Amino acid sequence: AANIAVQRIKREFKEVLKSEETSKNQIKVDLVDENFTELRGEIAGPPDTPYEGGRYQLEIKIPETYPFNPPKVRFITKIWHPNISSVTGAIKLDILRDQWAAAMTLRTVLLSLQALLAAAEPDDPQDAVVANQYKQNPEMFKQTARLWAHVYAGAPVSSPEYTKKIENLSAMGFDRNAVIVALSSKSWDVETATELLLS
Amino acid sequence: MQIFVKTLTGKTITLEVEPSDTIENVKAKIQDKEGIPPDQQRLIFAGKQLEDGRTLSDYNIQKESTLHLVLRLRGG
């Protein structure tokens, strides 16, 4: 691999390990291979957001052109967010597309993803369904995102009012995970969620 | 040929063009006068967004026609 790519990643990996943000358990990174082309990241959900108390793992692939192109980052841990696909974990963020600069690092990417969680841009969505709900019904989006933080990301609390609707459909014989996804995507309409599950 | 381009401010940009000019050329002129990047510019005439490769003459755009400019900040 190119010496500049290898040296940059080795430097940036240690900077994350030694960081104040890692000592506070906000971010971390681990190696996957021996060659430094695949990494696994973890970020904590930010405070005063639906993602609080959740932990989100990230697939990080380093291009042969690093540091002049951005890493490819994907959410492994499912998340309900306008700028992250609830199906694939693909991320819409300018620094991972057209506003990467070579001075950016693993640290600043991980921190930027946390800032994205704290401040969505629903007018440039990755997930049109999540974005529609974010704008049309803020309180539902927040409770749905918190439910997903609990179900997928280990966040402690989730909301009793959704529990009831989840249990009804679960009692129809549908899988709890499928029920969660159907009800979230149909904005908690039992009837259209049931229709989806029946297909 | 003189044409006008209206913004949502109300501000009218006056441009000098030819019927043979493409829509991207018109956007390049708008950049020269107003410092607005062409990839942020959507030009509208007769209720329809105009496309970059076609000319003013293709759209029946004439002397003292008024286009509309809406700024759409990229959004990939």
Numbering used by the authors:
A (entry chain A): 1 to 199
B (entry chain B): 1 to 76
Task: Show sentences the authors wrote.
The ubiquitin conjugating enzyme Ube2K (also known as E2-25 K and Huntington Interacting Protein 2) is a Class II E2 that preferentially synthesizes Lys48-linked chains on monoubiquitylated substrates, or forms Lys48-linked diubiquitin in the absence of an E321. Uniquely amongst E2 proteins, Ube2K has a C-terminal ubiquitin associating domain (UBA). The UBA domain is not required for the synthesis of Lys48-linked chains, but may act to tether the E2 to ubiquitylated substrates thereby enhancing elongation of Lys48 chains. Here we show that Ube2K is a monomeric E2 and the position of UbD is similar to that observed elsewhere, while several key contacts between Ube2K and UbA orient the incoming ubiquitin.
In order to ensure the formation of a stable isopeptide bond between Ube2K and ubiquitin, we mutated the active site Cys92 to Lys. To prevent the undesirable conjugation of ubiquitin to Lys97, which is in close proximity to the active site, Lys97 was mutated to Arg. The isopeptide-linked Ube2K~Ub conjugate crystallized in spacegroup C2 with one molecule per asymmetric unit and data were processed to 2.1 Å. In the structure, two conjugates associate with the ubiquitin moiety of one conjugate packed against the MGF-motif27 of the UBA domain of the neighbouring molecule. In this conformation ubiquitin is locked in an open position and there are minimal contacts between Ube2K and its conjugated ubiquitin. An overlay of the UBC domain of the Ube2K conjugate structure with that of the previously reported Ube2K UBA:ubiquitin complex has an RMSD of 0.48 Å. In contrast, the position of both the UBA domain and ubiquitin in our structure is shifted. When the two UBA domains are aligned, even though the same residues mediate contacts between ubiquitin and the UBA domain, ubiquitin is rotated relative to the standard ubiquitin:UBA interaction. Even though crystal contacts may help stabilize this conformation, this structure suggests a more plastic Ub-UBA interface than previously reported. The apparent dimeric configuration of Ube2K~Ub did not suggest a catalytically competent complex had formed, as Lys48 of the UBA-associated ubiquitin is ~30 Å from the active site of its partner.
